[PDB]
Enzyme design. Structure first.
Site, PDB file in Angstrom:
ATOM      1  N   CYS A 109       0.845  -1.203   0.000  1.00 37.07           N
ATOM      2  CA  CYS A 109       0.000   0.000   0.000  1.00 37.07           C
ATOM      3  C   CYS A 109       0.876   1.247   0.000  1.00 37.07           C
ATOM      4  O   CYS A 109       1.680   1.444   0.918  1.00 37.07           O
ATOM      5  CB  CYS A 109      -0.957   0.031   1.209  1.00 37.07           C
ATOM      6  SG  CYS A 109      -1.906   1.579   1.462  1.00 37.07           S
ATOM      7  N   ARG A 112      -0.061   4.580   2.861  1.00 39.72           N
ATOM      8  CA  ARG A 112      -0.020   4.234   4.278  1.00 39.72           C
ATOM      9  C   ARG A 112       0.412   5.385   5.176  1.00 39.72           C
ATOM     10  O   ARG A 112       0.439   5.205   6.396  1.00 39.72           O
ATOM     11  CB  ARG A 112       0.930   3.062   4.520  1.00 39.72           C
ATOM     12  CG  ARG A 112       0.372   1.692   4.188  1.00 39.72           C
ATOM     13  CD  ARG A 112       1.404   0.645   4.498  1.00 39.72           C
ATOM     14  NE  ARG A 112       2.477   0.643   3.517  1.00 39.72           N
ATOM     15  CZ  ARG A 112       3.650   0.054   3.700  1.00 39.72           C
ATOM     16  NH1 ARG A 112       3.908  -0.567   4.839  1.00 39.72           N
ATOM     17  NH2 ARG A 112       4.563   0.097   2.749  1.00 39.72           N
ATOM     18  N   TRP A 281      -9.321   6.108  -0.466  1.00 40.49           N
ATOM     19  CA  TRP A 281      -9.669   6.886  -1.644  1.00 40.49           C
ATOM     20  C   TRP A 281      -8.683   6.485  -2.726  1.00 40.49           C
ATOM     21  O   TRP A 281      -7.626   5.922  -2.440  1.00 40.49           O
ATOM     22  CB  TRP A 281      -9.646   8.396  -1.376  1.00 40.49           C
ATOM     23  CG  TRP A 281      -8.375   8.896  -0.784  1.00 40.49           C
ATOM     24  CD1 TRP A 281      -7.173   9.104  -1.441  1.00 40.49           C
ATOM     25  CD2 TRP A 281      -8.154   9.266   0.578  1.00 40.49           C
ATOM     26  NE1 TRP A 281      -6.230   9.577  -0.556  1.00 40.49           N
ATOM     27  CE2 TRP A 281      -6.806   9.687   0.687  1.00 40.49           C
ATOM     28  CE3 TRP A 281      -8.965   9.289   1.721  1.00 40.49           C
ATOM     29  CZ2 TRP A 281      -6.256  10.107   1.898  1.00 40.49           C
ATOM     30  CZ3 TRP A 281      -8.421   9.714   2.912  1.00 40.49           C
ATOM     31  CH2 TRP A 281      -7.082  10.115   2.997  1.00 40.49           C
ATOM     32  N   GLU A 286      -4.985   3.854 -10.505  1.00 36.78           N
ATOM     33  CA  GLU A 286      -5.739   2.614 -10.402  1.00 36.78           C
ATOM     34  C   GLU A 286      -6.888   2.601 -11.400  1.00 36.78           C
ATOM     35  O   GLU A 286      -7.058   1.632 -12.154  1.00 36.78           O
ATOM     36  CB  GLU A 286      -6.255   2.437  -8.988  1.00 36.78           C
ATOM     37  CG  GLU A 286      -5.202   2.429  -7.927  1.00 36.78           C
ATOM     38  CD  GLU A 286      -5.876   2.149  -6.571  1.00 36.78           C
ATOM     39  OE1 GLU A 286      -6.617   1.132  -6.493  1.00 36.78           O
ATOM     40  OE2 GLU A 286      -5.714   2.970  -5.635  1.00 36.78           O
TER      41      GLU A 286
HETATM   42  C1  HEM Z   1      -5.673   6.645   2.132  1.00 37.70           C
HETATM   43  C2  HEM Z   1      -6.163   6.142   0.996  1.00 37.70           C
HETATM   44  C3  HEM Z   1      -5.473   4.915   0.380  1.00 37.70           C
HETATM   45  C4  HEM Z   1      -4.749   4.967  -0.739  1.00 37.70           C
HETATM   46  C5  HEM Z   1      -4.458   6.247  -1.570  1.00 37.70           C
HETATM   47  C6  HEM Z   1      -4.249   3.623  -0.999  1.00 37.70           C
HETATM   48  C7  HEM Z   1      -3.446   3.241  -2.064  1.00 37.70           C
HETATM   49  C8  HEM Z   1      -3.309   1.941  -2.500  1.00 37.70           C
HETATM   50  C9  HEM Z   1      -2.997   1.467  -3.839  1.00 37.70           C
HETATM   51  C10 HEM Z   1      -2.707   2.318  -5.113  1.00 37.70           C
HETATM   52  C11 HEM Z   1      -2.967   0.122  -3.795  1.00 37.70           C
HETATM   53  C12 HEM Z   1      -2.692  -0.828  -4.989  1.00 37.70           C
HETATM   54  C13 HEM Z   1      -4.043  -1.470  -5.336  1.00 37.70           C
HETATM   55  C14 HEM Z   1      -3.889  -2.342  -6.553  1.00 37.70           C
HETATM   56  O1  HEM Z   1      -2.894  -2.141  -7.269  1.00 37.70           O
HETATM   57  O2  HEM Z   1      -4.734  -3.229  -6.815  1.00 37.70           O
HETATM   58  C15 HEM Z   1      -3.275  -0.310  -2.442  1.00 37.70           C
HETATM   59  C16 HEM Z   1      -3.351  -1.613  -1.975  1.00 37.70           C
HETATM   60  C17 HEM Z   1      -3.601  -1.979  -0.651  1.00 37.70           C
HETATM   61  N1  HEM Z   1      -4.060  -1.143   0.342  1.00 37.70           N
HETATM   62 FE1  HEM Z   1      -3.899   0.875   0.395  1.00 37.70          FE
HETATM   63  N2  HEM Z   1      -4.750   2.786   0.004  1.00 37.70           N
HETATM   64  C18 HEM Z   1      -5.507   3.546   0.884  1.00 37.70           C
HETATM   65  C19 HEM Z   1      -6.184   3.073   2.008  1.00 37.70           C
HETATM   66  C20 HEM Z   1      -6.041   1.817   2.560  1.00 37.70           C
HETATM   67  C21 HEM Z   1      -6.726   1.300   3.732  1.00 37.70           C
HETATM   68  C22 HEM Z   1      -7.774   2.164   4.472  1.00 37.70           C
HETATM   69  C23 HEM Z   1      -6.305   0.036   3.964  1.00 37.70           C
HETATM   70  C24 HEM Z   1      -6.673  -1.001   5.055  1.00 37.70           C
HETATM   71  C25 HEM Z   1      -7.360  -0.744   6.189  1.00 37.70           C
HETATM   72  C26 HEM Z   1      -5.308  -0.259   2.936  1.00 37.70           C
HETATM   73  C27 HEM Z   1      -4.595  -1.418   2.755  1.00 37.70           C
HETATM   74  C28 HEM Z   1      -4.162  -1.873   1.526  1.00 37.70           C
HETATM   75  C29 HEM Z   1      -3.748  -3.224   1.247  1.00 37.70           C
HETATM   76  C30 HEM Z   1      -3.731  -4.359   2.304  1.00 37.70           C
HETATM   77  C31 HEM Z   1      -3.430  -3.289  -0.053  1.00 37.70           C
HETATM   78  C32 HEM Z   1      -2.897  -4.514  -0.830  1.00 37.70           C
HETATM   79  C33 HEM Z   1      -4.029  -5.503  -1.059  1.00 37.70           C
HETATM   80  C34 HEM Z   1      -3.620  -6.399  -2.197  1.00 37.70           C
HETATM   81  O3  HEM Z   1      -2.496  -6.973  -2.178  1.00 37.70           O
HETATM   82  O4  HEM Z   1      -4.434  -6.545  -3.135  1.00 37.70           O
HETATM   83  N3  HEM Z   1      -5.171   0.843   2.112  1.00 37.70           N
HETATM   84  N4  HEM Z   1      -3.470   0.834  -1.685  1.00 37.70           N
HETATM   85  C1  LIG Z   2      -5.714  -6.607  -5.863  1.00 40.94           C
HETATM   86  N1  LIG Z   2      -6.524  -5.372  -5.791  1.00 40.94           N
HETATM   87  C2  LIG Z   2      -6.659  -4.801  -4.426  1.00 40.94           C
HETATM   88  C3  LIG Z   2      -7.312  -3.439  -4.570  1.00 40.94           C
HETATM   89  C4  LIG Z   2      -8.188  -3.262  -5.641  1.00 40.94           C
HETATM   90  C5  LIG Z   2      -8.830  -2.053  -5.867  1.00 40.94           C
HETATM   91  C6  LIG Z   2      -8.594  -0.992  -5.011  1.00 40.94           C
HETATM   92  C7  LIG Z   2      -7.701  -1.146  -3.954  1.00 40.94           C
HETATM   93  C8  LIG Z   2      -7.556   0.035  -3.070  1.00 40.94           C
HETATM   94  C9  LIG Z   2      -8.018  -0.092  -1.754  1.00 40.94           C
HETATM   95  C10 LIG Z   2      -7.942   1.009  -0.920  1.00 40.94           C
HETATM   96  C11 LIG Z   2      -8.374   0.890   0.503  1.00 40.94           C
HETATM   97  C12 LIG Z   2      -7.440   2.204  -1.419  1.00 40.94           C
HETATM   98  C13 LIG Z   2      -7.026   2.295  -2.745  1.00 40.94           C
HETATM   99  N2  LIG Z   2      -6.556   3.480  -3.224  1.00 40.94           N
HETATM  100  N3  LIG Z   2      -7.117   1.215  -3.559  1.00 40.94           N
HETATM  101  C14 LIG Z   2      -7.063  -2.364  -3.708  1.00 40.94           C
END
Ligand code: HEM
Ligand SMILES: CNCc1cccc(-c2cc(C)cc(N)n2)c1
Ligand code: HEM
Ligand SMILES: CNCc1cccc(-c2cc(C)cc(N)n2)c1
Ligand SMILES: C[C@H](O)[C@H](O)[C@H]1CNc2nc(N)[nH]c(=O)c2N1
Ligand SMILES: C[C@H](O)[C@H](O)[C@H]1CNc2nc(N)[nH]c(=O)c2N1
Ligand SMILES: [Zn+2]
Lengths: 410, 410
Positions: A109, A112, A281, A286
């Site tokens: 992520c 974070r 958000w 994405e």
């Molecule tokens: C503040 C806003 C957030 C942004 C801008 C953000 C950004 C991102 C992005 C760009 C990805 C890649 C997703 C993909 O490529 O499919 C990601 C994955 C992920 N996010 Fe963050 N995220 C946010 C909030 C959160 C929250 C609230 C959580 C958990 C409580 C979280 C946990 C994760 C996890 C665990 C993954 C990886 C999941 C996977 O391997 O598919 N994120 N995030």
């Molecule tokens: C393998 N896809 C995981 C996945 C798929 C689609 C969106 C996310 C995502 C989730 C959160 C909390 C924030 C963000 N900006 N994107 C993650």
């Protein structure tokens, strides 16, 4: 044993010792590196107190009461409940800590920097798929906040035996439907066509368009799941226009504001929460790179480059590259002219480097997956391209889990 | 023990067993992944025959005479020369095989589909920095071939004791000079300013412009190196124009046609060739993304976006992204209108997937570094973004080595 990661755009170095606290294995051996494999691969009481011990020890060692009797009585309390019931229950404060650190340890992520500002919804008193549907609507509404998005997670009852499991069968709470056509092609989102079939299978009444919000398939206490449609007034959607190209409106594209992953597992102190939808958000890419331009997704580069009148005979005109930049200018612009929270891949990678500093200072490390942190376009004009990252598995943590229609004793 | 890599754009799977033959360690442990650390870290006769044995065994097991007496007499011959002289010498055929497989095993190279079509120049009879300068000019001229580029490597005498070492002190044979200015700023290539100082230090007479070809600093038999200037008629350069924007000419940029890395070490059968310049042709993004737009390099996004009149107040306009695509359209266009060999990141990643198939078939694997294979722009609209790669260290191999001005007993 105190390894070093360098940044090559800045010549800045930091020292990782947090990885000493790591526990789980990575897939990589001393002689093989799996850093680009997507997913490499009841719990007894003999194993469950060590995990409960480790968690609680760092949880009191966070609130500057490590080792106290308030700690020791909590350790003794969990110990004896792990004797009695064999499992145990987390305090409200232990759940909010554990959840925020699962996010904090999520090496894939990039957003974070925000890990501490997370809103935890305790749905551990939930019993029914209707109760699930209520908690999840309240999450959508709160996390959306009129477009001023706020991040949140809803934690449903933990796995107990293994059969009785709360599961959101949707991969994300809000996704567009996917129908394959009689002519072989595909309308909507191709990623969801297997899911969409299971939805119509359970009696969904598909509008059969492009951007149809799917219903929720919520499984409560291991029960067969039931279909509920989020009230559309709760689903905030952004119509995608370009700030130069008026023909871009006629592409008729839109996206939903709320990224809310529903299919992962929240491990805290050895407890497993099979249902834990979490939302933030979107980073612009994405939607504008992956959702819109993945070949097996909406695959719109074809039509965008047409309307730009691009040299499409030659691979080497970078016509693909050119239409890809305009599309992410259009995602970004549209979300911000509507006051819906979105962040661009430049400002998000910058924050992550910024976050990475504080982690190496007041924590001694930051598990990070370069393959996933680097945005899927313009990689090297963002600062994370030049940042060496150490990937390792800390806990609490988010984990993938099987799809339930491929494991449920139905 | 027979691991699987998946491609997610195609749902295609291949089985890696070639990694069983791996030998060297990677930096990753079972509990830590170093896949994004750039460079993780005399030889006796007790260790040198095992390496000589391993090499020769697969070299006769390539020409379908594994285990024969022609093999055994070659093994006995090397064995006894490793008794007598303690080192040994490769046959011409063993050097051409070993060199082509160092390329073949180079997991960070996307253009390896071409690994077999390589021209080996045996410079092991060389004795002088002037002899080095002759061999290297003949390499430049051959590898360039009037713009119809051909790939090649020149192999200078192997390391023997450790003091007597042939080294090309240049990082690449052809690079633009780098001068820092009295006003703090930098003219030319900032990456080379340390090198450029050592060149003027050894009596180079700098023209002090932007695109000044550096001279060669060639060290022969451990001797102090000497400056030689490649005849400019041998240095093929491409002026960079855009096929739409006439102001692009006035940017006055150019690049050289020949990518020729000179600072790496060729390991074959336990022998170490400290001087082994190898050359191919450029993938467009190396110039148009990294050379031209890295912050610590030519850093031209500023001026390109100006002349496009771009929204440069906002990070989120993707003004950076937009000027980055035009610049690689200009690199590509310029190189091809001059008939100088260049490949675009789409056609090169496609070939690599294509190469990757054949490796898993007629060899059982393909060591590959995703962090380096994915082009530094438009990552996910190329097919290698979706290809899981296994990284592992096979031999023969190219390795990094220290800079000589930081190890030479001068
Ligand atoms: C503040 C806003 C957030 C942004 C801008 C953000 C950004 C991102 C992005 C760009 C990805 C890649 C997703 C993909 O490529 O499919 C990601 C994955 C992920 N996010 Fe963050 N995220 C946010 C909030 C959160 C929250 C609230 C959580 C958990 C409580 C979280 C946990 C994760 C996890 C665990 C993954 C990886 C999941 C996977 O391997 O598919 N994120 N995030
Ligand atoms: C393998 N896809 C995981 C996945 C798929 C689609 C969106 C996310 C995502 C989730 C959160 C909390 C924030 C963000 N900006 N994107 C993650
Ligand atoms: C056919 C033309 C070739 C193309 C299109 C090509 C492509 C590339 C590219 C894009 C890189 C990344 C460079 C960087 O990011 O700094 C690279 C690195 C590399 N190439 Fe290839 N290459 C070619 C020929 C060769 C040859 C002839 C050799 C050796 C005999 C070779 C061996 C390597 C090695 C060892 C590296 C990695 C070196 C390092 O880690 O810095 N390549 N190549
Ligand atoms: C760390 N830089 C290594 C480096 C720097 C610059 C160029 C290359 C290169 C070399 C060859 C033979 C082909 C190619 N297309 N590019 C490699
Ligand atoms: C920190 C990171 O490992 C570094 O920026 C790497 C990433 N991938 C790369 N990939 C290529 N092809 N060339 C590079 O110089 C780099 N640099
Ligand atoms: C094969 C490869 O591991 C796969 O394409 C990964 C690469 N990096 C990624 N990075 C992000 N952020 N999201 C992804 O889905 C992927 N996919
Ligand atoms: Zn690794």
């Amino acid at each position: 044993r105190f390894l070093k990661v360098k940044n090559w755009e800045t010549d800045v170095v930091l020292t990782d010792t947090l990885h000493l606290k790591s526990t789980l294995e990575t897939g990589c051996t001393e002689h093989i590196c799996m850093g680009s494999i997507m997913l490499p691969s009841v719990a007894t009481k003999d194993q469950l107190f060590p995990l409960a011990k480790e968690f609680l020890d760092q949880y009191y060692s966070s609130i500057k009461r490590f080792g106290s009797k308030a700690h020791m009585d909590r350790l003794e309390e969990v110990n004896k409940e792990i004797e009695s019931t064999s499992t145990y229950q987390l305090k409200d404060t232990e759940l909010i800590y554990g959840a925020k650190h699962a996010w904090r340890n999520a090496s894939r992520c990039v957003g974070r920097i925000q890990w501490s500002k997370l809103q935890v919804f305790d749905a551990r008193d939930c019993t029914t798929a209707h109760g699930m549907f209520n908690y999840i609507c309240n999450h959508v509404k709160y996390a959306t906040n009129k477009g001023n998005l706020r991040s949140a997670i809803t934690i449903f009852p933990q796995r107990t035996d293994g059969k009785h499991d709360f599961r959101v069968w949707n991969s994300q709470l809000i996704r567009y439907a996917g129908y394959k056509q009689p002519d072989g092609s595909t309308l909507g989102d191709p990623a969801n066509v297997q899911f969409t079939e299971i939805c119509i299978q359970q009696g969904w009444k598909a509008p059969r368009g492009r951007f149809d919000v799917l219903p929720l398939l919520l499984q409560a206490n291991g029960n067969d799941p039931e279909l509920f449609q989020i009230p559309p007034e709760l689903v905030l959607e952004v119509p995608i226009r370009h700030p130069k190209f008026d023909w871009f409106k006629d592409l008729g594209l839109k996206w939903y504001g709320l990224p809310a992953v529903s299919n992962m597992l929240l491990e805290i102190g050895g407890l497993e929460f099979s249902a834990c939808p979490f939302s933030g958000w979107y980073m612009g890419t994405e939607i504008g790179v992956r959702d819109y331009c993945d070949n097996s997704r909406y695959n719109i580069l074809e039509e965008v480059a047409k309307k730009m009148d691009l040299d499409m005979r030659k691979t080497s005109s970078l016509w693909k590259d050119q239409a890809l930049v305009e599309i992410n200018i259009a995602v970004l612009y549209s979300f911000q002219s509507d006051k819906v929270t979105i962040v661009d891949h430049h400002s998000a990678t910058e924050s992550f480097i910024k976050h990475m500093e504080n982690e190496y200072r007041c924590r001694g490390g930051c598990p990070a997956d370069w393959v996933w942190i680097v945005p899927p376009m313009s990689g090297s004009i963002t600062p994370v391209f030049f940042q060496e990252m150490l990937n390792y598995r800390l806990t609490p943590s988010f984990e993938y889990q099987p799809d339930p229609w491929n494991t449920h004793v139905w």
